[PDB]
Amino acid sequence: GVPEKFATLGLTYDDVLLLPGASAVLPNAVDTSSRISRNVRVNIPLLSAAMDKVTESRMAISMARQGGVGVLHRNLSIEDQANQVDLVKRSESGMVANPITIHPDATLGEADALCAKFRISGVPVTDGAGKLLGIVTNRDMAFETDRSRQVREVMTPMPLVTGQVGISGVDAMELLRRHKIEKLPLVDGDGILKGLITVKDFVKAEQYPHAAKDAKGRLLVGAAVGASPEALDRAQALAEAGVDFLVVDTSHGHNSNALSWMSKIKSSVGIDVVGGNVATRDGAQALIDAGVDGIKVGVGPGSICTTRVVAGIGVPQVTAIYEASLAARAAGVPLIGDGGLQYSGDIGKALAAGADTVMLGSLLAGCEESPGELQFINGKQFKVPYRGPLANVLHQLVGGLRQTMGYVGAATIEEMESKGRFVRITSAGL
Amino acid sequence: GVPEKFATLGLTYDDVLLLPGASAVLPNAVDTSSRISRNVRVNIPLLSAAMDKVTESRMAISMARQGGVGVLHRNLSIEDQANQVDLVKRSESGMVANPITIHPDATLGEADALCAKFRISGVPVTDGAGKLLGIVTNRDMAFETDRSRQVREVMTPMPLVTGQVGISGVDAMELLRRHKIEKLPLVDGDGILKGLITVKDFVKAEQYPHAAKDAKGRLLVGAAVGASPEALDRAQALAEAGVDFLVVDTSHGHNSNALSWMSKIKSSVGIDVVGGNVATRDGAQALIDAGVDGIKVGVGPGSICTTRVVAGIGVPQVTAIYEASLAARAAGVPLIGDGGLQYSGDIGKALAAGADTVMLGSLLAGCEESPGELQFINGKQFKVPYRGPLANVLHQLVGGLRQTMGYVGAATIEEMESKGRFVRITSA
Amino acid sequence: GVPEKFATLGLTYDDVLLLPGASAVLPNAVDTSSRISRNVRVNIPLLSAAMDKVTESRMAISMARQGGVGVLHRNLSIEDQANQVDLVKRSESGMVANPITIHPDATLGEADALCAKFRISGVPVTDGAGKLLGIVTNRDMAFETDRSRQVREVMTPMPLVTGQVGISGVDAMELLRRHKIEKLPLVDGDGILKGLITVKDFVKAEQYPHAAKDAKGRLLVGAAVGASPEALDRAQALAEAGVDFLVVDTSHGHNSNALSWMSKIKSSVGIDVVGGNVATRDGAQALIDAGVDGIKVGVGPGSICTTRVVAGIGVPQVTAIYEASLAARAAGVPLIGDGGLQYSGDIGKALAAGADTVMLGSLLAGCEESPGELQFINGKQFKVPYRGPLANVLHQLVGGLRQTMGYVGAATIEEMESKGRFVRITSA
Amino acid sequence: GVPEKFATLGLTYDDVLLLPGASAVLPNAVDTSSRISRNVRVNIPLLSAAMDKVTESRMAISMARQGGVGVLHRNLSIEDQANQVDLVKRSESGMVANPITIHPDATLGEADALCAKFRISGVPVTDGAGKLLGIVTNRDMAFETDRSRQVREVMTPMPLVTGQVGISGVDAMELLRRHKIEKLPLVDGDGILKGLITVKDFVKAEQYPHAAKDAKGRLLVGAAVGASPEALDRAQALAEAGVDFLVVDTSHGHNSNALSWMSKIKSSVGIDVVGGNVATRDGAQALIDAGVDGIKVGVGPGSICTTRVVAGIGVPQVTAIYEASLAARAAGVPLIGDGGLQYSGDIGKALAAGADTVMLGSLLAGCEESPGELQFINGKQFVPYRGPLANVLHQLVGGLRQTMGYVGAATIEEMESKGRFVRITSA
Ligand SMILES: Nc1nc2c(ncn2[C@@H]2O[C@H](COP(=O)(O)OP(=O)(O)O)[C@@H](OP(=O)(O)OP(=O)(O)O)[C@H]2O)c(=O)[nH]1
Ligand SMILES: Nc1nc2c(ncn2[C@@H]2O[C@H](COP(=O)(O)OP(=O)(O)O)[C@@H](OP(=O)(O)OP(=O)(O)O)[C@H]2O)c(=O)[nH]1
Ligand SMILES: Nc1nc2c(ncn2[C@@H]2O[C@H](COP(=O)(O)OP(=O)(O)O)[C@@H](OP(=O)(O)OP(=O)(O)O)[C@H]2O)c(=O)[nH]1
Ligand SMILES: Nc1nc2c(ncn2[C@@H]2O[C@H](COP(=O)(O)OP(=O)(O)O)[C@@H](OP(=O)(O)OP(=O)(O)O)[C@H]2O)c(=O)[nH]1
Ligand SMILES: Nc1ncnc2c1ncn2[C@@H]1O[C@H](COP(=O)(O)OP(=O)(O)OP(=O)(O)O)[C@@H](O)[C@H]1O
Ligand SMILES: Nc1ncnc2c1ncn2[C@@H]1O[C@H](COP(=O)(O)OP(=O)(O)OP(=O)(O)O)[C@@H](O)[C@H]1O
Ligand SMILES: Nc1ncnc2c1ncn2[C@@H]1O[C@H](COP(=O)(O)OP(=O)(O)OP(=O)(O)O)[C@@H](O)[C@H]1O
Ligand SMILES: Nc1ncnc2c1ncn2[C@@H]1O[C@H](COP(=O)(O)OP(=O)(O)OP(=O)(O)O)[C@@H](O)[C@H]1O
Ligand SMILES: [Mg+2]
Ligand SMILES: [Mg+2]
Ligand SMILES: [Mg+2]
Ligand SMILES: [Mg+2]
Ligand SMILES: [Mg+2]
Ligand SMILES: [Mg+2]
Ligand SMILES: [Mg+2]
């Protein structure tokens, strides 16, 4: 009973429910892996948002360890954001081919700061030519009080227990078990340091068996850039640091200038580039025509959010995802749902509506791994209420998603769009 | 104005109303009987849910006395659940062919514990062959202080006033009246005890004239089982104890393994087997194809309930009942509405939408007959706010249904689906 | 304008404030040490209460490390409470003269369980005569997958780096630094194991420089007992495990039977015994006459708490402390304030009113170190809202007390009673 | 019915009321002048607190124009605080002997920045020796777009209408009127600039006839310093910039080290030094013995405030003022009531209890003249926006005049004797 100008009805997550369907698969047996972009895969379909209150290196590391991925925020210098990337890539199994080093004339303070930075308990000591001279570890410094003392005075000097480039995990773990050590430098025939294996690599692989990793076995990570000449310089620095994909993050992804920078940034790097944000079919198509490898969907998804109140602009998120998916699914381009979430059950709704993954934002701002210092004022806060470890949040969200997939009969994420049947509900049902 | 992926609108009870229609029948004259399953009938269209806070024997007994039926929960051992079944079946008129007995060397404590267990005021005393030796009753023990004293010392010994196998109610009552006694053992020609009638059988028949009973005149009762190998052992034990139907209770009735166990639980017993839960036409058809004698409908029926919040899964209950009824009515399989209730008027809505009965849940957890212990903390609670006797809840619910039926013109539940006309309403 | 029967006005913490006074001492320079009892001293004047939701070994260890002390609750078996004591006493520097050991035939699973129990990363391996055979540590077991494997197969055998009984801290650390090891077994001339030093002893001494310790350098701990024959057996078992003081915990410390058991318990052990609870001068004097080494003050201290509502019994806590201190100060017996706290500033008020230390209760139940299990239900809770590490609670409380002492001019706790001047305030 | 240790009852403003008394004086006729310290006088008995959200130069100027005084906060460098002092002292009539100047080689941007800084509409242009070359004013720059143009190109050059040092207000005004100009440079016989009069001096004197001023006719101002070697240097820098009194501002005024610095600072300057904070008779006496010229009273005056909750320390403010005044009134040392205010009626209560003036704090943080930036977020904010200070002070002073009329006090000094108190219950 409305004119055509107003015919379309937009739906939010609360407006719809998924129906139970014929199922031969239990929640604990479904596969939750999905694609961030054409060439980036995760083991749970969740990202942490590129917000300065949410994702720096510690959050990105935990997300990837749990099988998702973090998108490092860009509200910091190029050098600081690239450093955040490096910390993620060189977290565990990341020093097999790019180890940290220290010169023997350095102080213990410099060595300990490096150990704290990369969260590891030792540094190979090398000369200017990269020849291995020895190794200084936490135990060598445990009883040292003078931080000005030189590394050479406390390090364990060569000859050390070492391995060859390409040593297998089983063989490297047999040199840490036989010699009662936790570190294994990798050297070439001339004794030049080529890599480093430590017990951390094996401990973290066992504790986090579903970690999302790159082809080199290092934790996956993404990073946000803007749409500007500066964003191009930032993109290059992040690619050099080893980032696995870029997110060109704009409030209006359908702006022609933003689209142009997406194309320019994409053509200037060899890694996947995600573009956003859009909330319509034609906007998603414009991003695809601009060449992005994934799209991010969400413009004014939240009730009485800023763009809605200030500008009257917005799209209910189920409709936004569905409309964008008409273009994205037709092109085979993964779709990230970004905004409007209110329950773990909304994840399955997003996937059945056409999303491949879902980005989590303010929900992860109170988590231990988010940036900011934990402060105490009668209760615990992040300087936002303290929520505890990320792992507890993700376990509940992924547990919920597995329930949805079992109820719908989807053994894989790719089956969700076809097997998920929707019903709309009224405000009485809500 | 939505894409077809989202065309369907689901309706809950609050979304609709029933219209008044042409009527020639008053509320006090309508018939409220309905079917639980193909071969199980009740006198009011209501069940108590298989929740451990709701239905054990006391709840099941009261439900059946009021004309409904209870579904005994399964959060207990097979032997404990079978015992709950036995307590219901042998409540009133249930010992005519399976009496309790005690040996003459038993203590008064053992006899009184048996009386308390079955809520009967005496025990026939027999020897190892079943020969009736006497009877010990509440009055025989009233003034006794030593609980170790042997039954034989206080029992009334044979010869007793007894009845024959097959004695009628009228004849049994006349014997009780004439001899001013409350118990009538039933014996065969050799004096072997075959059954027992007590005044409770007549008192409860008069107090509860609409009791739901089996073909032998014993209170009806159901019991829940899971979907697993253990559920098959449980089913056999419950059937042996005299349960009238089984409810294969699963959260996702459309799961292939759950459906398979339904066909394995149904084919292994001779009593009716209900399956659930489903909320779609295709789900109901899958239950029917698996061979169940009734279906239970309800998946995420409640606003912001657990499956909805955790998993985003759910179906508004009016739509769920209607869609499932499209399959159930064509197959002649009764449909139990399980969940989403908020008012007594919702019962009539469920029936007009296609349900045959409605299962009551947390509503009843506060009733006197629920398993919890009544405790006092400034006010009364169950250890859940105390609601009082089940009878008060059912009286209001059944009274409401009779009003609906009078307004719609339905003289029977079976007329509700055709005569009940709906209108949707807005939030205003 | 009231009868003499009602002349006395009782004051709670909120009724009074402390005045600023002449001061030559800054908050960061005051001394916060005080006495729990005649012969037990702490570095901050705070105890954790003997409640089963608050203080087991983990809470007691953290309290002592921060300079206070925990009182282990008694809602568990005698052997379990004594085990809790043992865990505290042998936390750090507690195995120098009483080490844990394991047979060479024991499994890695058994060795790891012992390491987890005492929060130590290795076990000396000995024979039945206590002769040292080797040592098995976390690194020896790090890559092992079979938990049934023998410890002798993965352990480092003698000869080990060892020290003499009585080795100094500097000398032991020198051995750990030169041999790049974390353990130093202590042996006699015949190679019998006499003690164990590990890097934990040095790490924890550096991290917690204000730890409250006994004469042997082990963390202080108290434990609660009741007032009954069983409490006498419990007291002995706790004393044997190395507890530093006992708290006879009753709600009516002025009961003649409770007073009698305090004397009996006091006379049956050699360690300090605290008695409570009381809230009057005559009650404190009765505890003192019974022979206790400290008193605990608090009977119905909180507005609309249970004893007040149920029984109308209670004493505002400032009055309770002051009245009890009239007896306790004359006898030189320390006074523990137990209850009624609402602000960190109430600590200074209690001390100025006559308390020597203050017991903290439900405040701490939400701390990480409390016995409950940390669970996540949208937010973090203990099974009570999760508050985080004890250290921040104590840091805020001790910081506030230091502010109080600076304002009043008290350089030491005992100066609080004389230099702390009070003013009463109205509800405005 | 309590032990002697707890005998004393402390009273706050809400605990008491003043009685009406015999009165022959109406509210509009009472005199509201009082003393900040032995040698500093105000026309309304109110100060603005030395909080960085309350009093910088703009707040201090408005307070002084209304007859009170501001105490400039010290959460800034010595040179930044001294600059704040200079801005107040050289607000109106403050350049008669210390004018701003600019060189002919300066730009219009630099000239306009100076005019904006001192809120003056022109700058005398001088050479390096101070010889007057001309004057550049707002009207000279009104139509100038280039902000890099040199002042010499747009200034009015000498010969200007000038006056001599010591010219009277009446004579200076006649020159401004006769020549239809707003500026009057003051020069010596050699044409060296010695001072400056502008129309602002007369406009502001007429708009603010009760402006609290010093002996030279410049707006009064105070400034806070700490209790430390750095505060001794800060005190000298503030006294060189022309501050009229210092406030040695500590959370614990009865601390021996704080008292020692009060004595050291007092003896190192020639201006009045106020010390605080205290809340007892012995604390006030210790401040007096240290040599201060006024005391500030208030330690944990507010219900469930920080010092009360964290440390259990505090004194209800009526008791604090009364007890401190027992020492203050005996020595003739003025007493500043600092904290606990909740109504305009509490001012009269403070004065009747023994205070000479009352310091206003967070109340004023929302006023236009407070340091914060006025921002619009659906509504106006700085805390909520309160508008001009004048509106707050008008209501507060109006209330005090009502109190004095009801009590019969023609002067502030009569409040202590004529103000009769009654305590009230929570009912
Ligand atoms: N010097 C120094 N070392 C740090 C610091 N933080 C962590 N480490 C060390 O790096 C390794 C990894 O620490 P984790 O805390 O578990 O790493 P994670 O953040 O990536 O999860 C550990 O050594 P490990 O040898 O791999 O394991 P383990 O021997 O401690 O068991 C740890 O001792 C620090 O701030 N300074
Ligand atoms: N020894 C013993 N008897 C119990 C106990 N509980 C109930 N009874 C008796 O069993 C019969 C049923 O009691 P009800 O209370 O009416 O049974 P109900 O729970 O099934 O409704 C009564 O005897 P009746 O002869 O059938 O009726 P009446 O003579 O009491 O009127 C009653 O006295 C018990 O705990 N111990
Ligand atoms: N096998 C085993 N060891 C445990 C366990 N819990 C703690 N530990 C070990 O005991 C020592 C104390 O751990 P903490 O966590 O600091 O002790 P705490 O509870 O008393 O504070 C550490 O070894 P350390 O050598 O003293 O310190 P470090 O080598 O880790 O630096 C730690 O590795 C456990 O559950 N199982
Ligand atoms: N160039 C410039 N001038 C400013 C600025 N702010 C104030 N003025 C001028 O200085 C004099 C004081 O302005 P006020 O607003 O009254 O000063 P106030 O802050 O102390 O109250 C006025 O000139 P007047 O000649 O004394 O008065 P009138 O001719 O404006 O009436 C005014 O035009 C500024 O930011 N830049
Ligand atoms: N590959 C190696 N060859 C020789 N010595 C080594 C080697 N790796 C480590 N060390 C030395 O062995 C000793 C133990 O160091 P390791 O790396 O095994 O543990 P750590 O991380 O310092 O110990 P902890 O886990 O107790 O903090 C140190 O002196 C270290 O320098
Ligand atoms: N069939 C019977 N023949 C003979 N005596 C009987 C018979 N049934 C019961 N009695 C005896 O009659 C007396 C009354 O018992 P009855 O069963 O009538 O009532 P009750 O339930 O014990 O009493 P109450 O209802 O007062 O609690 C008892 O001594 C009982 O032993
Ligand atoms: N006193 C000792 N003499 C000889 N070997 C020792 C001695 N103490 C420990 N070891 C051996 O040294 C190796 C290192 O053990 P240590 O006690 O130093 O700690 P760890 O178990 O390696 O701890 P971490 O978890 O910190 O790596 C182990 O093989 C242990 O058996
Ligand atoms: N003492 C003076 N002698 C000569 N000319 C002067 C003198 N003072 C100002 N002028 C010049 O007179 C003109 C008017 O300036 P004046 O100071 O009177 O007002 P203004 O503050 O610049 O203007 P307005 O009040 O309109 O903003 C300007 O050219 C100014 O240079
Ligand atoms: Mg290590
Ligand atoms: Mg270690
Ligand atoms: Mg009877
Ligand atoms: Mg160790
Ligand atoms: Mg280690
Ligand atoms: Mg002008
Ligand atoms: Mg003008």
Author numbering:
A (entry chain B): 7 to 389, 434 to 480
B (entry chain E), C (entry chain N): 7 to 389, 434 to 478
D (entry chain L): 7 to 388, 434 to 478
What does the paper say about this structure?
We then set cocrystallization experiments to obtain high‐resolution structures of (p)ppGpp‐IMPDH complexes and were able to solve the structure of the IMPDH from S. coelicolor bound to ATP and ppGpp at 2.0 Å resolution. The AU contained 16 IMPDH monomers that are related by symmetry axes and allow the reconstruction of IMPDH octamers within the crystal lattice. These octamers are formed by dimers of tetramers assembled with a conformation that resembles, with only minor deviations, those adopted in the presence of ATP and GDP by the proteobacterial PaIMPDH enzyme. All monomers in the AU showed well‐defined electron density in the Bateman domain that could be unequivocally attributed to ATP, ppGpp, and two magnesium atoms. Surprisingly, ppGpp was bound to a previously unrecognized pocket within the Bateman domain adopting an elongated T shape conformation. 42 The (p)ppGpp binding site is different from either the second canonical (GDP2) or the third eukaryotic noncanonical site, although its δ‐ and ε‐phosphates partially occupy the canonical Site 2. The ppGpp binding pocket in StcIMPDH is mostly formed by the polar side chains of residues E118, R125, and N144, that form hydrogen bonds with different atoms of the guanine ring. The α‐ and β‐phosphates tightly interact with the basic sidechain of residues, R71, R125, K206, and K210, whereas δ‐ and ε‐phosphates, which point toward the γ‐phosphate of ATP1, coordinate two Magnesium atoms, together with the carboxylic acid of residue E188. No electron density was found in the canonical Site 2 or the noncanonical Site 3. Nonetheless, the results described above indicate that, in the presence of ATP bound to the canonical Site 1, the occupancy of the (p)ppGpp pocket is necessary and sufficient to induce the inhibited conformation.
